[PDB]
Design a protein around this ligand. Structure first.
Ligand SMILES: *[C@@H]1O[C@H](CO)[C@@H](O[C@@H]2O[C@H](CO)[C@@H](O)[C@H](O)[C@H]2NC(C)=O)[C@H](O)[C@H]1NC(C)=O
Ligand SMILES: *[C@@H]1O[C@H](CO)[C@@H](O[C@@H]2O[C@H](CO)[C@@H](O)[C@H](O)[C@H]2NC(C)=O)[C@H](O)[C@H]1NC(C)=O
Ligand SMILES: *[C@@H]1O[C@H](CO)[C@@H](O[C@@H]2O[C@H](CO)[C@@H](O)[C@H](O)[C@H]2NC(C)=O)[C@H](O)[C@H]1NC(C)=O
Ligand SMILES: *[C@@H]1O[C@H](CO)[C@@H](O[C@@H]2O[C@H](CO)[C@@H](O)[C@H](O)[C@H]2NC(C)=O)[C@H](O)[C@H]1NC(C)=O
Ligand SMILES: *[C@@H]1O[C@H](CO)[C@@H](O[C@@H]2O[C@H](CO)[C@@H](O)[C@H](O)[C@H]2NC(C)=O)[C@H](O)[C@H]1NC(C)=O
Ligand SMILES: *[C@@H]1O[C@H](CO)[C@@H](O)[C@H](O)[C@H]1NC(C)=O
Ligand SMILES: *[C@@H]1O[C@H](CO)[C@@H](O)[C@H](O)[C@H]1NC(C)=O
Ligand SMILES: *[C@@H]1O[C@H](CO)[C@@H](O)[C@H](O)[C@H]1NC(C)=O
Ligand SMILES: *[C@@H]1O[C@H](CO)[C@@H](O)[C@H](O)[C@H]1NC(C)=O
Ligand SMILES: *[C@@H]1O[C@H](CO)[C@@H](O)[C@H](O)[C@H]1NC(C)=O
Ligand SMILES: *[C@@H]1O[C@H](CO)[C@@H](O)[C@H](O)[C@H]1NC(C)=O
Lengths: 298, 50, 347, 49, 50
């Protein structure tokens, strides 16, 4: 059954800046101690990303349906496993086919079917006071799924689910692409210690999976989780708190990048060759250092 | 060093590596690709000498 | 009795057309300078000949440990095939691709390969192998090719422009024709736009041919998009059923698991040896390497883009590859008129 | 050792040649050293000084 | 595409143009030639045939 969440304050959208984020390995060949140029779909440097909250304090349980233009950079700052998955599709209403990638308390589930998704999909964690324990109670995502072409279920695990109190401790970065019937996923995990704002730094994402789904993705929507206790009084549509979490969305464009490989084979730096004229001379000289002078660019 | 770097150009062939072409292609179809590479690399040597 | 070898010779024709003299261009450095100057006489001096070359002694093959045969029997010998609009895709892995087992039971009217020669299939290893299956009319088989038009290639099944793999088709009148008429197989006839490559559309919504929306009622200028083939034993060959399999794969970039039939040898090091690693062939000297590859990579390439490192598919150890021809050579001659004695300088 | 004047010794230390010496043996660059050192990368492709 | 639902062609080959560009072009001096032949002889309707 589907429930429309109420008691959620509406706020204007927030934006921030990506500081040389979203670089991934273009191919699967080992290289070391080299500057290598490659043209592909990247997140441009110093771009303007959108920012979304799950902060109780306002509630602000954000989960809009967003565009999927040419691929998505998705970043997530968490400490309590709130962000649980995504749904990708065109209409999301059982007339067409949709992709579900969800992490339920025990398994990772990837399905391609004709879903009647809920208007407000979510997952539910309930907390018992008498014995301190958090367990998953609700799975309210879709009404029916009929014609399934692709399915995958991962091996069983036990997740933590406990609400934490410190600042954000985990950054999880994903890149999603859809090319010639393949849905491609790159990812990387990083330890952080911060409270707000996407952090600085550089880290290349590695290939994770390549799914042969064969559908026309145009939009997507994030799947989050809820907390309920004895301090959350009400019915289904009003008795719920949030739990802090944040996520950031950016869009990829075709660009030429100059990537740097150290002597161990890891990408440690990059130049966006179409950001600035300075970057263009860096790209032409094939170096990260420019000597004093005047250069013709283009 | 520029001559050494110019060995990664395809010159309009499937790849710039001879061993990659020689596997996956038989002599009659490998000949046209090899011919493209040969023309490109002779041009590079000529430019250097000039 | 003597035995012939492939050599380059410089032959001399006199003014009557008879061969009166020859130079074996690979006997000596002196002969090599004779061959280069294209003369039988060399003046006094020092000449650069050619870099010092080493010929390989052994040949080695290193393929992964695979024992099972690929499922040719539930791909090419399935009891029921899919309709072209809802076409089937199947993963293939961890199996030897020995297709000569198909010789004694199957005959293919169509078999065409893109991006690879059919005579190299036995020596290669294949990455990300998939099999697509469907049934079409006989006339429509020409449309299963890159850059084609027609209703199959626009609404039902589309290939990429850059396609690596093979297309295989055979007549199936005995299996898929019924005396009354076999209406199990369907195809899409109306669509707003063309499909993208390797895209599957399985919706059944009333197609609006003109204005005046349909409200899903199927009236005038409002159609049901899917239509049925009528397959009967007495049709012309153009209208008979055909079973089609499309094989899609990748070559020589990432680790592979299919790997056609070829026996592996032992790994020999520190000698110039012809080598085959997962279908990639070359010559050189193999040494132990300190490089550490991430689990998803198989080959290492340098600035000139040539492969210089490889993970062994058996022992999973990284190996460096080095050319075995290196070093400059020169020859000093007092003049062929004076003497045949020469000196050689190895730089 | 070199019978050079003081000024010639100073001058010769201000220009750094790309390679000192002309005997680089095959065993000297085998494996990793190749394709890292630029001189051996040149010499494996027929380019000699 | 109005021919899709009524006609099936065993042969369809285009010279000087790609079949995927036909929808975006305008055509000058269009003529249609019609005849009937034996099935074996269809391969002869091509440039440079005997
Ligand atoms: C949540 O609200 C949505 C409206 O956004 C409800 O969806 C509507 O349901 C009615 C009756 O089934 C339809 O007539 C409307 O067309 C629907 N609107 C949309 C936008 O789909 C939904 O039923 C509500 N969920 C509940 C009450 O559980
Ligand atoms: C990032 O993108 C947003 C959305 O386009 C920009 O927000 C707009 O900014 C202009 C100028 O300040 C305003 O006139 C618009 O009304 C804003 N739109 C919205 C929806 O708020 C934003 O300026 C961009 N850059 C930064 C640094 O935020
Ligand atoms: C998470 O999802 C998986 C797969 O959807 C669930 O595992 C299935 O559970 C049902 C109900 O007992 C079984 O009939 C299936 O055989 C299970 N499939 C497996 C194990 O592959 C799992 O129960 C879900 N977890 C939670 C907490 O709901
Ligand atoms: C998609 O789902 C629909 C709905 O079930 C399928 O259509 C029905 O399939 C059953 C199964 O054989 C038939 O008995 C019905 O006659 C079909 N039509 C209706 C109106 O129920 C459809 O086959 C499915 N499509 C695919 C590609 O699996
Ligand atoms: C993929 O899906 C999108 C959205 O359903 C299709 O784009 C729409 O096409 C219709 C006409 O067919 C237009 O009226 C809409 O404005 C388009 N919307 C968008 C967001 O582009 C697209 O045609 C589909 N692609 C394929 C190959 O079927
Ligand atoms: C106590 O914990 C167990 C497992 O965590 C749970 O099943 C049980 O319901 C809890 N007690 C009550 C009264 O809910
Ligand atoms: C490279 O690998 C070595 C050996 O593991 C390690 O000590 C070093 O920190 C790594 N990084 C760099 C930049 O050398
Ligand atoms: C060539 O032919 C002429 C005429 O027959 C003959 O006299 C001469 O001996 C032949 N040989 C040479 C080397 O000229
Ligand atoms: C295909 O399956 C049929 C079913 O019995 C069998 O008779 C035939 O020999 C099979 N052909 C093969 C395995 O090539
Ligand atoms: C393959 O065979 C080799 C030698 O027979 C053995 O060492 C290795 O463990 C086997 N398995 C794999 C996965 O390499
Ligand atoms: C061709 O003409 C016949 C004559 O009646 C007609 O039945 C058939 O539908 C026509 N086919 C077309 C117009 O595609």
């Amino acid at each position: 059954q589907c429930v429309n969440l109420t008691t959620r304050t509406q706020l204007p959208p927030a934006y921030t800046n990506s500081f040389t984020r979203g670089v991934y390995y273009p191919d699967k060949v080992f290289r070391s101690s080299v500057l290598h140029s490659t043209q592909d779909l990247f997140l441009p440097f110093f771009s303007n990303v959108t920012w979304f909250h799950a902060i109780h304090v306002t509630k602000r349980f954000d989960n809009p349906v967003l565009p999927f233009n040419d691929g998505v950079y998705f970043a997530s700052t968490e400490k309590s496993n709130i962000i649980r998955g995504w749904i990708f599709g065109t209409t999301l209403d059982s007339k067409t086919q949709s992709l579900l990638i969800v992490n339920n308390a025990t398994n990772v589930v990837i399905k391609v079917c004709e879903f009647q998704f809920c208007n407000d999909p979510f997952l539910g964690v309930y907390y018992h006071k008498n014995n301190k324990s958090w367990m998953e109670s609700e799975f309210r995502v879709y009404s029916s799924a009929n014609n399934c072409t692709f399915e995958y279920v991962s091996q069983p695990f036990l997740m933590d689910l406990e609400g934490k109190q410190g600042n954000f401790k985990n950054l999880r970065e994903f890149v999603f692409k859809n090319i010639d019937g393949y849905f491609k996923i790159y990812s990387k995990h990083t330890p952080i210690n911060l409270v707000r704002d996407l952090p600085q730094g550089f880290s290349a994402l590695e290939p994770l999976v390549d799914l042969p789904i064969g559908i026309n993705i145009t939009r997507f929507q994030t799947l989050l989780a809820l907390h309920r206790s004895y301090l959350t009084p009400g019915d289904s549509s009003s008795g719920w708190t949030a739990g802090a979490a944040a996520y950031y969305v950016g869009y990829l464009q075709p660009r030429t990048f100059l990537l740097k490989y150290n002597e161990n084979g890891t990408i440690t730096d990059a130049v966006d060759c179409a950001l600035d004229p300075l970057s263009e001379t860096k790209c032409t000289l094939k170096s990260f250092t420019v000597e004093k002078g005047i250069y013709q660019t283009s | 060093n520029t001559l050494v770097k110019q060995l990664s150009s395809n010159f309009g062939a499937i790849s710039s590596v001879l061993n990659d072409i020689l596997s996956r292609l038989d002599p009659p179809e490998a000949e046209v690709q090899i011919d493209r590479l040969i023309t490109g690399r002779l041009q590079s040597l000529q430019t250097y000498v000039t | 009795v003597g035995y012939l070898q492939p050599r380059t010779f410089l032959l001399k024709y006199n003014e009557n057309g008879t061969i009166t003299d020859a130079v074996d261009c690979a006997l000596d450095p002196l002969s090599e300078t004779k061959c280069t100057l294209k003369s039988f006489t060399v003046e006094k001096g020092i000449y650069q000949t050619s870099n010092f070359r080493v010929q390989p002694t052994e040949s080695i093959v290193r393929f992964p440990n695979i024992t099972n045969l690929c499922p040719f029997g539930e791909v090419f010998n399935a009891t029921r095939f899919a309709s072209v609009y809802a076409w089937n895709r199947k993963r293939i892995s961890n199996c030897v691709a020995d297709y000569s087992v198909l010789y004694n039971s199957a005959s293919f009217s169509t078999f065409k390969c893109y991006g690879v020669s059919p005579t190299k299939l036995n020596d290669l290893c294949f990455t990300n192998v998939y099999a697509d299956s469907f049934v079409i009319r006989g006339d429509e088989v020409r449309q299963i090719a890159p850059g084609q038009t027609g209703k199959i290639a626009d609404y039902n099944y589309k290939l990429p422009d850059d396609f690596t793999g093979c297309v295989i088709a055979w007549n199936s009148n005995n299996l898929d024709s019924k005396v009354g008429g076999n209406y199990n197989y369907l195809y899409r006839l109306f669509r707003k736009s063309n499909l993208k490559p390797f895209e599957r559309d399985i919706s059944t919504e009333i197609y609006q041919a003109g204005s005046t929306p349909c409200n899903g009622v199927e009236g005038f200028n409002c159609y049901f998009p899917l239509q049925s083939y009528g397959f009967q034993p007495t049709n012309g060959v153009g209208y008979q059923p055909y079973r089609v399999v499309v094989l899609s794969f990748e070559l020589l970039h990432a680790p592979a698991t299919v790997c056609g039939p070829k026996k592996s040898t032992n790994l020999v090091k520190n000698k110039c040896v012809n080598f085959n690693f997962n279908g990639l062939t070359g010559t050189g000297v193999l040494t132990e390497s300190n490089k550490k590859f991430l689990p998803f990579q198989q080959f290492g390439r340098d600035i000139a883009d040539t492969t210089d490192a490889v993970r062994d598919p058996q022992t999973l150890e990284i190996l460096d590859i080095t050319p075995c021809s290196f070093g400059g050579v020169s020859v000093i001659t007092p003049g062929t008129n004076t003497s045949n004695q020469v000196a050689v300088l190895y730089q | 050792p070199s019978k050079r004047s003081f000024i010639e010794d100073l001058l010769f230390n201000k220009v750094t040649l790309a390679d000192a010496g002309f005997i680089k043996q095959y065993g000297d660059c085998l494996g990793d050293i190749a394709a890292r050192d630029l001189i051996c990368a040149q010499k494996f492709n027929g380019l000699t000084v």
